[PDB]
Amino acid sequence: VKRGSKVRILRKESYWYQDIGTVATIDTSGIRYPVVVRFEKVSYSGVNTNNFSLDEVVEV
Amino acid sequence: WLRDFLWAQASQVIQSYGSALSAYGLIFLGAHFIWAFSLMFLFSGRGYWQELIESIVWAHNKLNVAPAIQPRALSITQGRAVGLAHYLLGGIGTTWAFFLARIISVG
Amino acid sequence: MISDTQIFIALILALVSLVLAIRLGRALYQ
Amino acid sequence: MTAAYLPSILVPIIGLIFPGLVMAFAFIYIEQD
Amino acid sequence: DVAGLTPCGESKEFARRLDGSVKKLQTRLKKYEAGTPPALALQKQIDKTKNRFDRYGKAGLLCGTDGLPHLIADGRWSHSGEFVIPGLFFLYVAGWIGWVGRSYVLFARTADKPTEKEIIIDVPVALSFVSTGFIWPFSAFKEFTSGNLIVPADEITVSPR
Amino acid sequence: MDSNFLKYLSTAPVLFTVWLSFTASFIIEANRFFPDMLYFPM
Amino acid sequence: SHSVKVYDTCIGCTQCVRACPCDVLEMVSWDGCKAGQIASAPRTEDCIGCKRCETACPTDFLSVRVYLGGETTRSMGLAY
Amino acid sequence: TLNLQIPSPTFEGSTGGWLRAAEVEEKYAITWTSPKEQVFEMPTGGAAIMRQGENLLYLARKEQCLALATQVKNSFKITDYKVYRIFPSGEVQYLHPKDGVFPEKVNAGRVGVGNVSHSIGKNLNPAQIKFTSKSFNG
Amino acid sequence: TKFPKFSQALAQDPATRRIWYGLATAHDLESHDGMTEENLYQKIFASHFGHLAVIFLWTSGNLFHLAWQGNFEQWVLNPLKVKPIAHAIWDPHFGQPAVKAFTKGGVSYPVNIATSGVYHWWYTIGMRSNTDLYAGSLFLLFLAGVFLFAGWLHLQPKFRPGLSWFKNNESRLNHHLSGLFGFSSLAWSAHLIHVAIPEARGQHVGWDNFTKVAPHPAGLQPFFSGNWGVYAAAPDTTNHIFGTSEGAGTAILTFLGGFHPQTQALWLTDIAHHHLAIGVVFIFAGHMYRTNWGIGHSLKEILDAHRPPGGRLGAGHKGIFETLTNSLHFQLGLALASLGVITSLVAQHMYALPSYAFIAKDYVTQSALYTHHQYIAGFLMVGAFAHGAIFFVRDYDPEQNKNNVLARILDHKEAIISHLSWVSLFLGFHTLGIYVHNDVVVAFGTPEKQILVEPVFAQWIQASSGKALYGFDVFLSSSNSVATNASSNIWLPGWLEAINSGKNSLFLPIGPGDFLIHHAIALALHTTTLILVKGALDARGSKLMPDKKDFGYSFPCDGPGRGGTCDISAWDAFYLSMFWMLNTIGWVTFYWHWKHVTIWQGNAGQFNESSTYIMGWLRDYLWLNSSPLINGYNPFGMNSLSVWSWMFLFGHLIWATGFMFLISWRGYWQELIETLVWAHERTPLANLVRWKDKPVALSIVQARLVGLIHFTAGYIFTYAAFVIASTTGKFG
């Protein structure tokens, strides 16, 4: 995956699980969840972006 | 109070069907209904309705008809306010229909 | 009909059941 | 009623003495350290 | 006839209901002068009551011992107009409403701000959609068979089990 | 006609009220000219 | 006392620490996120359980979690 | 170290102050320094005037002290406040800020308490840990 | 403080919350400090012994209080005229007119008139005097003492059973099916043949003569000979007077069908053959599982093998064996569901086919029995779903249930909940629309425009059972059908006589009001199921709270964040479904009581014309039948209904008090209690007195529960007072 790609989320506890977001930035340092994904639907707390690991993210 | 005021003087609003005062009987029943409907908002809480709305959102998502404006349960304050508004409307309407039918018939 | 002695016999049986119930309650309470 | 004295003996005991002693001893039990 | 009921055009209790309604309106009519607007209104109500009871008596409706028409809804064709045909009319209108609403939602998803399209309706586009709903069963079935109605289970959000 | 007034007229409460009043007027006029339709005549 | 846990999805935004009315949370050094810091709960005996920290948390499902447990005078917020 | 001789803000008193549990179980103290005499709202209800210089005030709860601290931080730009816990024996326990640095700022020497090394969705099921002293975090 | 000795966290609570939560978690043994599985099962076994002893003591108390203060010996002589006495009244708060007004039943002291029907049951099973009633009370006292001793003994060391004994499914199933169901039914058939039927035929049989008084003149020789039909010959004549030999038969096992023409109850010989056949069938069922001798079925093999090969159920029933055996909440949910279904079945079948002599003429007793067992049924079904939700929180292991039927329920829970929501909204929209449509059109003076749907499906079922009212002419209502010819020699004459006589509640005639009230019942059942199923399936987590299983089955909320999370736990779904359960049993009992009251009055057309709109229910059932109840006491005097007249108002009070805990919430009450704490601490001559526990407001879950308790008690007491006093005032 790369910046700007459309990805599906595989984190089970996530609000956007099996929904589609857009990758905004992939951090290169040793971060546990380096994939910033921005979503068009807001969560219950009103946020629309979250960080995920590579294995919680699949390109569509 | 239960027998000689409530039971005795409600005879006019419950026997109003088929007369000109039948609108008071209809409003009597409808106001009992709205009052009881208010207790769903007053006695319950938001999280149950949000999870039920999650299931209904799954149903609309299955047919690709989920709305862009995401449906949410009413806020806790709005749940209290809606329950109070329908409670006051139901109780005041019940007394309204009962008083008006009774006093128009006997006075 | 029922006599006084029969009621007393029933009361004695109920007292025995009370003692057994107290023992079961103490056993369940560890 | 045979043994008609038994209601007048037992009803005040069961309704006032039994709950008073139960409430007192339960109070002592639940408040003691 | 069906379920022991009798046709309303020969039930004596149906006639008793009609007679009681006409008498109840006529005793009100008695207190007004002929030519007054209350008298004309009451006579029109009497005429409407008579026409309604005549029409119900000539329609093949079945009346019970209460004296009121009882509907049969088991599927028999002799009573298909009591539930089945109103049901088909409702199902046509309701499928129309659902189809045009779904079409507008899918159009609004394509807009610049979809939520603005939800609260401020594009009226010409919405009127186009509500025009499209007359052929909703065939359109909806073709939408279904082409994979455009049902979305797969791996593309819908679900809670942790 | 002003486009902003038309956009206000296209809002959900106004269009909701107009459409439901229009539907109610259809039901009312249908029941005025064809009253007491308990059944589909067949 | 209540139990407060911080999971490694924390991004170190310090919002939960700023939202805490009882000084339960604090920021400690970490390498798991870009901010270089993670929340911690060393003072959960003062936790009243208000869940203002969870309200402040911006990560999809929360990084800070409060599990209500045994009630004490401090956790019940009793001034008497 | 709490100086007990620090003067208090001029307050006319209220019924919202500390009860018998303050003198029997524990009490809290907050000190701060103001550049001028100015009126602030008491967390127990009422208006008090803090003096120029040092101010010592006694409360029943830690949350009342931290609410007063937040009020004087956001309305008077006072950040030097210190919150202590006092026991009936006379023991004073310094509470806030614990290491001198505010908790929203990272300070060296702090160790993480309650940190879990996985996401919240990786917790164990209750049936896995039933009749067993394992924590649900794993 | 060491009252909650099972919870260290509760015992260190400094407030009044400690006492409440120790009271409310006392029997939740799985959550106690240091609870092991073996200790849990042993405590449950002893507690079950204690509940059995409580049941036996309660039944012995009913028997004793009747044998001492009742009029059973007077009631046996004249069963249709003498009012049955439950117990005596000794209340020192009575005035003299209340003493006079409660002096009924032919005795000289104040009494309560029994509505439980224990007279009819005990008379039918052969009890005649007060002496055998007293002997039965003594025997049940002894039995309760025996079970208390057994509960104590099976907790003593070297008698505490192991977990392998408790989880022995096959042995317990075989013994409980063959012995507890089968041999108990066979022994009850023996009691009916040996004792109850001879006492019904005017012949005394007791322990002093039952070994010399043969139940049948031919003895056991036809049974050992294979000439079993001799036991069916010479049944009771239609002129038989119950409890006498006049018109009595000699048969002990018949299949007559229908009712005894005098008692209006089922034939006792039919009941004896029924319980004999049930015993034989159940003993055959109880030899099915393998325990020690190679033959028999293995439950695990049956469960694992029944996977449909088309794969629509996934892995089928694999892992269900361990999941059910390891979870007591799964077992409790299954048991409570089956019990609730069967007590509903008891309520329907006992009014429709009464078995006790002369109880069909006791209208108050029939109303009380139906209402009682239906409310018990609603409680049991709510409990089944609640403990199923508890199983999902506490005992469901997903890894042990891979692709199982349980896992696939969890995987299509959204479809299940959404389709339940759809069917509830469907039913409610159109049922309420038809009722409101009928209300408006009757109010405007045109009842002929009502939408009145004939319930032809259920009428067709009645005709299939032989009801000739509707002219459907199918199955048993057709004289040429193979179903008619098949049963014509055995039970068809008596059954056809009972179903086509309009003197009983056997398949009562139904119209459009019946149609509407069953569809309202369907609405209420589907909606209560929606709440309960949605609570059970979202108990482990939702989108709003994906880690709900970490928080347990019951917790107040998850705070105002994420939009607000009030009533999000599965316990809260139990709490919400309790109101809907009360609503559905209210609708069911309202329907039963109004239909039966109009039928008993000879005015069934009043129900047929007024039940199609809501104002008819409010006016002709609630308002009309409230008049003798609300006149139990008045400014002119009082009568025996006054207690119900009190209890009615009592119910209307406590129900309303429940509202206070369900509408007002905690923080208001906590601030009031803080002001009260200040007031007590600052008041002279009262601050010498100090509380040991700090006063706090009730917790969120506790207040929900307390409001539910006051609400439910008001519901039950209000309706019980109404139904008993209204039936008594109209008919008794």
Ligand code: CLA
């Ligand atoms: C089943 C329980 C029960 C029983 C047996 C009684 C019995 C009685 N009540 Mg009643 N009562 C009860 C529950 C009960 N009550 C409840 C729950 C309430 C609250 C609604 C009331 C409220 C109530 C009121 C308001 C009044 C009564 C009165 C009476 C008396 C009737 C009139 C009379 O002749 O008194 C004549 C009275 C006497 C001759 C005095 C008797 C004094 C007794 C024997 C002293 C006992 C001391 C004590 C119990 C020792 C044990 C302490 C230990 C438990 C810690 C009678 C003693 C009336 C009365 O007279 O009160 C005295 C009265 O005014 N009751």
Ligand code: CLA
């Ligand atoms: C575009 C319109 C639309 C469509 C096609 C659906 C489709 C569906 N809904 Mg839904 N719904 C909608 C709007 C819609 N909904 C709205 C606005 C609400 C809020 C009141 C709901 C509330 C709702 C609930 C609570 C439930 C459903 C359910 C369902 C399903 C079963 C059908 C049903 O019960 O209908 C009944 C629908 C209603 C009672 C509400 C409809 C309200 C109006 C009449 C429809 C909107 C018309 C719209 C204004 C058209 C504008 C188009 C124009 C701009 C061109 C199905 C997936 C059920 C389900 O999950 O079944 C599996 C269920 O339980 N829906």
Ligand code: CLA
């Ligand atoms: C033949 C041997 C036998 C018998 C008679 C029983 C009997 C019983 N066992 Mg059991 N048990 C057995 C062998 C046996 N067990 C074996 C071999 C094992 C080891 C594998 C166990 C292990 C075991 C455990 C672990 C437990 C029991 C329990 C029970 C009791 C269940 C509660 C009860 O009273 O239900 C009574 C039920 C009936 C009489 C019939 C069922 C009712 C249905 C719904 C039909 C009734 C309808 C009918 C119309 C009612 C008419 C009455 C009306 C007119 C008033 C019951 C006394 C439980 C208990 O309470 O322990 C103290 C318990 O926890 N058993």
Ligand code: CLA
């Ligand atoms: C749904 C109901 C059901 C089902 C499907 C089964 C199924 C089974 N049970 Mg079970 N059982 C049940 C209810 C049920 N049971 C109940 C209700 C009870 C108790 C009241 C029992 C009690 C029970 C016991 C105690 C045992 C079983 C056993 C068995 C298995 C034996 C299979 C068998 O008979 O092969 C036998 C094979 C044949 C009969 C084939 C016939 C052989 C030849 C072809 C004869 C024909 C010859 C010729 C054509 C005919 C003319 C002959 C002439 C010349 C004389 C089988 C899996 C046994 C087992 O294995 O346990 C696992 C066992 O021990 N069951």
Ligand code: CLA
């Ligand atoms: C008389 C009181 C009343 C009524 C009508 C309802 C109605 C409803 N409840 Mg409910 N509830 C109540 C009391 C009531 N509740 C109480 C006291 C509690 C205890 C807290 C609950 C607890 C509860 C739970 C826990 C659940 C429900 C559910 C439902 C819905 C499905 C059942 C149904 O019939 O769908 C049909 C709907 C109706 C009959 C509602 C009336 C619709 C009206 C008549 C349409 C007309 C609107 C009108 C034109 C608006 C004009 C207003 C304008 C002039 C200002 C429905 C909205 C369930 C649900 O959401 O299922 C999907 C659910 O999960 N309720």
Ligand code: CLA
């Ligand atoms: C899902 C909705 C629903 C539910 C839960 C029930 C439930 C019930 N009905 Mg009812 N019924 C329904 C819809 C429903 N009905 C409809 C739509 C009609 C036609 C008007 C009827 C007509 C009807 C009659 C005539 C009788 C019952 C009776 C009963 C009871 C016994 C079971 C039975 O006969 O099932 C019947 C239900 C069905 C056969 C199907 C229901 C489920 C489907 C999906 C409904 C959808 C129909 C669809 C919209 C129409 C198709 C288009 C058509 C116009 C061509 C039970 C309370 C009996 C009764 O009152 O006993 C006392 C009875 O005699 N029902």
Ligand SMILES: CC1=CCCC(C)(C)[C@H]1/C=C/C(C)=C/C=C/C(C)=C/C=C/C=C(C)/C=C/C=C(C)/C=C/C1=C(C)CCCC1(C)C
């Ligand atoms: C949620 C919870 C989580 C996990 C645990 C859990 C407890 C398992 C679960 C809850 C499950 C809940 C508690 C489930 C509760 C469930 C309900 C109450 C089960 C009712 C079943 C009715 C059966 C199918 C009998 C039907 C009659 C039919 C066969 C008759 C036909 C015919 C008969 C023979 C004779 C003539 C009539 C006709 C009609 C011709």
Ligand SMILES: CCCCCCCCCCCCO[C@H]1O[C@H](CO)[C@@H](O[C@H]2O[C@H](CO)[C@@H](O)[C@H](O)[C@H]2O)[C@H](O)[C@H]1O
């Ligand atoms: C070996 C292959 C075939 C085996 C068949 C066995 C059949 C069952 C045997 C039944 C039990 C034993 O039966 C044997 O003692 C019974 C004792 O009550 C006798 O029964 C006799 O006494 C009973 C009690 O007073 C009477 O009710 C009977 O009318 C009378 O016949 C049987 O007449 C006798 O045959």
Ligand SMILES: CC1=C(C/C=C(\C)CCC[C@H](C)CCC[C@H](C)CCCC(C)C)C(=O)c2ccccc2C1=O
């Ligand atoms: C029923 C209920 C809900 C559900 C109520 C929903 C979310 C609101 C429904 C609003 C509708 C959509 C607007 C008007 C409804 C009309 C009758 C028909 C729909 C019109 C559409 C065109 C929108 C809560 O959100 C809630 C929250 C907190 C405490 C109690 C409760 C509560 O009891």
Ligand code: SF4
């Ligand atoms: S629950 Fe409240 S007191 Fe506890 S850590 Fe979170 S914010 Fe602080």
